Amino acid sequence: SRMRAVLHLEHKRYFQNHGHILFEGLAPVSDCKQLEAELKLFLWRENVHRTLPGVQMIVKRVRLDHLAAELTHRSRVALVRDLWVQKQEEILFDDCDCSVLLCLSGEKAGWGLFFSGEYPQDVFDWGAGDTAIILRFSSA
Protein backbone atom coordinates (compact mmCIF):
# COMPACT_ATOMS: atom_id res chain seq x y z
CA SER A 1 0.00 0.00 0.00
CA ARG A 2 0.84 3.68 -0.28
CA MET A 3 -0.38 6.44 2.04
CA ARG A 4 -2.39 9.29 0.41
CA ALA A 5 -0.14 12.34 -0.17
CA VAL A 6 -1.44 15.84 0.63
CA LEU A 7 0.22 19.24 0.16
CA HIS A 8 0.64 21.34 3.31
CA LEU A 9 0.29 25.16 3.31
CA GLU A 10 4.03 25.36 4.02
CA HIS A 11 4.83 23.41 0.87
CA LYS A 12 2.77 25.99 -1.04
CA ARG A 13 4.62 28.80 0.71
CA TYR A 14 8.01 27.33 -0.14
CA PHE A 15 7.02 27.03 -3.83
CA GLN A 16 5.63 30.60 -3.79
CA ASN A 17 8.79 31.96 -2.24
CA HIS A 18 11.35 30.12 -4.38
CA GLY A 19 9.53 28.95 -7.53
CA HIS A 20 10.33 25.28 -6.96
CA ILE A 21 9.98 22.64 -4.28
CA LEU A 22 11.78 19.32 -3.92
CA PHE A 23 10.03 16.26 -2.39
CA GLU A 24 11.57 13.06 -1.15
CA GLY A 25 9.53 9.97 -2.03
CA LEU A 26 7.18 11.74 -4.44
CA ALA A 27 6.61 8.62 -6.55
CA PRO A 28 6.89 4.90 -5.55
CA VAL A 29 10.45 3.75 -6.14
CA SER A 30 9.31 0.46 -7.76
CA ASP A 31 7.16 2.26 -10.33
CA CYS A 32 10.15 4.47 -11.21
CA LYS A 33 12.60 1.57 -11.74
CA GLN A 34 10.04 -0.34 -13.83
CA LEU A 35 9.58 2.71 -16.10
CA GLU A 36 13.36 3.15 -16.39
CA ALA A 37 13.82 -0.53 -17.37
CA GLU A 38 11.19 -0.18 -20.12
CA LEU A 39 12.85 3.01 -21.39
CA LYS A 40 16.21 1.21 -21.60
CA LEU A 41 14.53 -1.54 -23.68
CA PHE A 42 12.73 0.94 -25.94
CA LEU A 43 16.25 1.90 -27.06
CA TRP A 44 13.91 9.43 -29.40
CA ARG A 45 14.11 10.34 -25.71
CA GLU A 46 11.38 12.98 -26.28
CA ASN A 47 7.70 12.41 -25.44
CA VAL A 48 8.23 8.88 -24.18
CA HIS A 49 4.67 8.93 -22.78
CA ARG A 50 3.49 8.38 -26.36
CA THR A 51 5.26 5.01 -26.28
CA LEU A 52 4.96 3.69 -22.73
CA PRO A 53 1.85 3.74 -20.52
CA GLY A 54 4.00 3.96 -17.37
CA VAL A 55 4.50 7.71 -17.76
CA GLN A 56 0.88 8.76 -17.63
CA MET A 57 0.24 6.02 -15.06
CA ILE A 58 2.75 7.61 -12.70
CA VAL A 59 1.39 11.10 -13.47
CA LYS A 60 -2.17 9.99 -12.75
CA ARG A 61 -1.64 7.60 -9.84
CA VAL A 62 0.70 9.96 -8.01
CA ARG A 63 -1.61 12.89 -8.97
CA LEU A 64 1.29 14.98 -10.28
CA ASP A 65 -1.19 16.89 -12.49
CA HIS A 66 -3.42 17.81 -9.55
CA LEU A 67 -0.41 18.67 -7.35
CA ALA A 68 1.11 20.90 -10.04
CA ALA A 69 -2.20 22.70 -10.55
CA GLU A 70 -2.53 23.23 -6.80
CA LEU A 71 0.98 24.72 -6.44
CA THR A 72 0.46 27.02 -9.43
CA HIS A 73 -3.15 28.03 -8.61
CA ARG A 74 -4.39 26.69 -11.94
CA SER A 75 -7.83 25.09 -12.47
CA ARG A 76 -6.23 22.16 -14.20
CA VAL A 77 -3.10 21.19 -16.04
CA ALA A 78 -2.20 18.13 -18.14
CA LEU A 79 0.99 16.45 -19.34
CA VAL A 80 1.92 17.91 -22.76
CA ARG A 81 5.61 17.02 -23.24
CA ASP A 82 8.30 14.94 -21.59
CA LEU A 83 12.00 14.09 -21.94
CA TRP A 84 13.97 11.19 -20.53
CA VAL A 85 17.35 12.64 -19.53
CA GLN A 86 20.71 11.21 -18.43
CA LYS A 87 22.18 14.63 -17.39
CA GLN A 88 20.61 17.78 -15.92
CA GLU A 89 22.14 19.91 -18.68
CA GLU A 90 19.64 18.29 -21.05
CA ILE A 91 16.75 20.00 -19.29
CA LEU A 92 16.31 23.19 -21.30
CA PHE A 93 13.85 26.08 -20.92
CA ASP A 94 10.15 25.29 -21.46
CA ASP A 95 7.45 27.90 -20.94
CA CYS A 96 4.83 25.46 -19.54
CA ASP A 97 2.88 26.34 -16.35
CA CYS A 98 4.87 23.84 -14.25
CA SER A 99 7.50 21.14 -14.76
CA VAL A 100 8.26 18.09 -12.64
CA LEU A 101 11.64 16.41 -12.65
CA LEU A 102 11.22 12.87 -11.37
CA CYS A 103 14.35 10.86 -10.62
CA LEU A 104 13.98 7.24 -11.91
CA SER A 105 17.01 5.45 -10.47
CA GLY A 106 19.89 5.42 -8.00
CA GLU A 107 19.91 6.78 -4.46
CA LYS A 108 17.35 9.53 -5.20
CA ALA A 109 14.91 7.38 -7.20
CA GLY A 110 11.33 8.60 -6.66
CA TRP A 111 12.42 12.15 -5.58
CA GLY A 112 10.70 14.86 -7.63
CA LEU A 113 11.15 18.60 -8.13
CA PHE A 114 8.25 20.87 -9.12
CA PHE A 115 9.47 24.10 -10.72
CA SER A 116 8.69 26.65 -13.37
CA GLY A 117 10.94 28.25 -15.94
CA GLU A 118 14.60 27.15 -16.23
CA TYR A 119 15.79 24.13 -14.23
CA PRO A 120 17.06 25.46 -10.86
CA GLN A 121 20.74 25.16 -10.15
CA ASP A 122 22.04 23.71 -6.88
CA VAL A 123 18.70 22.17 -5.85
CA PHE A 124 18.78 18.61 -7.24
CA ASP A 125 21.09 16.30 -9.13
CA TRP A 126 21.73 12.57 -9.63
CA GLY A 127 24.78 10.36 -10.26
CA ALA A 128 26.19 9.71 -13.72
CA GLY A 129 24.72 6.21 -13.62
CA ASP A 130 21.15 7.40 -13.06
CA THR A 131 18.39 9.00 -15.10
CA ALA A 132 15.35 11.19 -14.70
CA ILE A 133 12.28 12.24 -16.64
CA ILE A 134 11.16 15.83 -17.02
CA LEU A 135 7.40 16.23 -17.29
CA ARG A 136 5.89 19.40 -18.68
CA PHE A 137 2.40 20.40 -17.53
CA SER A 138 0.22 23.00 -19.27
CA SER A 139 -3.14 24.63 -18.51
CA ALA A 140 -3.42 25.37 -22.25
Dist. CA 110–CA 122, nearest whole Å: 19
The technique is: X-ray
Distance (Å) of CA 68 to CA 4, 24, 117, 137: 16, 16, 14, 8
What CATH architecture is 1-140? Roll (3.10)
Give the closest residue to 15 by CA, choosing from 93, 90, 82, 68: 68
Dist. CA 60–CA 57, nearest whole Å: 5
Kindly tell me the burial class for residue 113, based on how many C-beta atoms sit within 10 Å of its own C-beta (0-12, 13-18, 19 or more): buried
Q: What resolution (Å)?
A: 1.8
Dist. CA 71–CA 13, nearest whole Å: 9
Distance (Å) of CA 130 to CA 43, 65, 81, 89, 106: 16, 24, 21, 14, 6
Distance (Å) of CA 45 to CA 40, 92, 110: 10, 14, 19
Domain ranges of the chain: 1-140
Torsion of CA 6, 48, 34, 11, to 10 degrees: -20
